[PDB]
């Protein structure tokens with residue numbers, strides 16, 4: 115029943131998923147002045163040289179590029195993490211207009227979109243078990259602003275018209291997620307949750323300070339996708355973001371400055 119409309123959007127999720135109103139929900143506004151620099155935070159280690167993408171799917175909420183996570187091929191470690199986390203998929207959240215789209219905000223500033231590279235803690239053996247643990251996931255978030263094209267995004271952008279509607283999927287091999295990264299790995303980090311239902315409180319959020327730039331034509335191609343399935347009335351897939359949630363009893367730490 116859940117989605118991003120007036121009748122089934124974020125404001126409604128608590129009825130089906132009461133943890134919507136819980137103690138460590140995401141996303142949040144990052145208040146850059148009150149985030150605490152922590153000199154013991156390690157550099158983030160992103161090892162994506164052996165990444166194996168498999169498929170891309172429109173799930174009716176976003177599109178997901180899914181990876182083979184049956185071996186240690188594409189992993190995240192270091193940073194605030196004390197375990198190895200395997201890349202399972204990435205997806206984006208974006209807006210109807212360039213002035214909104216991101217889930218995390220920075221001093222209340224919204225970005226055009228937000229990339230989530232979803233990773234799960236290998237001590238829990240698989241993604242389904244990890245999500246049931248307070249330290250089960252590590253999600254690397256990267257802001258997108260509109261300006262110059264991101265060449266590493268283009269192969270993603272070019273396949274979207276093959277997965278226009280809910281439930282469509284396409285083969286998507288040999289995609290290199292290193293082409294979606296900014297120069298700097300400086301980050302903010304805090305304990306939070308999935309930002310869609312089931313909203314499980316199982317995520318260590320790692321949000322990069324440096325946005326990537328995408329072109330107006332790249333982000334336009336995102337807004338051409340559909341929430342509906344093939345042969346149903348067209349609802350453009352836009353504004354598939356959850357707003358900032360109360361920080362409550364949490365401190366956001368910074369790896370820098």
Ligand SMILES: Cc1cc(C)nc(SCC(=O)c2ccc(S(N)(=O)=O)c(Cl)c2)n1
Pocket residue numbers: 202203230231232241245251253307308309310311312317
């Ligand atoms: C195999 C698989 C992978 C993923 C990421 N989600 C699912 S079900 C949806 C889900 O659990 C999920 C949705 C959204 C997010 S987010 N927006 O990055 O916080 C995450 Cl981490 C998980 N299933």
Ligand SMILES: [Zn+2]
Pocket residue numbers: 205206207230309
């Ligand atoms: Zn997400």
